[PDB]
Amino acid sequence: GEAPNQALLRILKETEFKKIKVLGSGAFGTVYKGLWIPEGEKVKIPVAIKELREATSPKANKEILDEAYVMASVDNPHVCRLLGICLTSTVQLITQLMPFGCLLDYVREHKDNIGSQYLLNWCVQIAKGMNYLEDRRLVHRDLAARNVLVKTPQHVKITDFGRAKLLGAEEKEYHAEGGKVPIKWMALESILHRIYTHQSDVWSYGVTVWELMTFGSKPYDGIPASEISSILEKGERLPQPPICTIDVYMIMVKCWMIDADSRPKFRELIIEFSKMARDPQRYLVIQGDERMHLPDEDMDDVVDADEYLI
C-alpha cells in the first residue's frame, strides 16, 4: 500500500566533470572534489565525487548503489542530494559539495566562535531533515554528528545512508542481523533486539545534539562499548553539557527514554527548538555569545546543486 518511486537516477559521463582535488582516501576508495559540467548547459557545479578503488568485490559496488538508490529518492533542503552516478570501470557517486565538510569536525575547530543561534538553528534543520525522512517512511539508522555536513555555517544537511533502510506501508519496526554498529548513538531497543524504528532515530538525535552542545565531545568516552547496554539499563544517561539550560537538556533526556512512544517526534522537536531559536541566549549560555561570528578555485558560471533542477 505504497506509492511508486518515480525518482530519476541520472547517469553521468566521465568527460562531463573535472576532478580537481582529494578530500579523503580509503581502501574502499577515495573522495574527490571537482566541478560538474553538463555541457550544453553552460554551468559548473561544485560536487563531491566518491571514486571507487577498482579493487572491489561485486558486493561492495552494491552497498553504494543502494545508498545511491536512497539518495536519489529524497528531495529536502536539509537532506544531502545525489546528483548522479558514473559507471566507469568503477562506480563513483556524484553528490553536492559541502565545503565546510563534517559538522562534528566543524564544531571542534570553531569551538571558539560558535554561538547559540547557530547551535539551535542546526538542531532545527536536522529535525526538519529527519522529519522528511519519516514522511518518506525511512529510517537513517546512523544519525550522528559525523554524518551531518555543512554547506554553509547557516545550512547543514543529513547524509550517510549506507545503513538507511525503508519500511513498507504496514511496517513499524524491522530487524537486522549484524555488522559493525554505532553502539553509543543507538537506542536500547536496537542494541538488545536489533530493532530500529523512527523513535530509535530520535535517540540518535539527542546524542547528536549532545555532541553539538559539548562542542564535539565523545559520548561515553573511556567506557567500553560492551558496557553501554548494561549502563543504559541502569538508567544512566549522558551528562548535561555546561552551556545547556535545563529546558534544552530536558529535551535530550526525553529522546533517551526506554519507552519509544514516550520519546518526542521530529515534528515536535522542530517546534521546541524553533521556539528556542527565537531567543537563543535564554536557552544556551555561552561566553562571548554576544560577539560571535562565522564565515576560491574561474567561478563565473558556477551554480550550486540546490539551484540546479531538472
Binding site: 550522528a144 559525523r146 549484524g178 555488522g179 559493525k180 554498529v181 554505532p182 553502539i183 553509543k184 548513538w185 542494541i191 562499548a225 560492551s226 547496554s229
Partner: peptide
C-alpha cells in the same frame, strides 16, 4: 572506531 560488532 565507532562501529562495533557486539553479540
Amino acid at each position: 572506531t565507532h562501529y562495533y560488532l557486539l553479540p
